[PDB]
């Protein structure tokens, strides 16, 4: 339970992070 829950939360956040870093990259260099 706790481990599963936390890995789902981690996963979600890393998708958001990935997206945001790509958007930042775009804005700084284009």
Q: Tell me whether residue 3 or residue 26 sits nearer to Na ion (CB atom).
A: 3
Chain positions contacting Na ion, by CB under 5 A: 1-5, 7, 10-11
For residues 22 and 26, what is the distance between their CA atoms, to the nearest angstrom?
6
DSSP letters, 1-30, are -HHHHHHHHHHHHHHHHHHHHHHHHHHHH-
Q: Which residues bind a copy of itself (CB under 8 A)?
A: 2-3, 6-7, 9-10, 13-14, 16-17, 20-21, 23-24, 27-28
Considering beta carbons, is residue 9 or 23 the nearer one to Na ion?
A: 9
């Amino acid at each position: 339970g706790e481990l599963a829950a936390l890995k789902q939360e981690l996963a979600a956040l890393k998708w958001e992070l990935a997206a945001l870093k790509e958007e930042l990259a775009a804005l700084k260099y284009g």
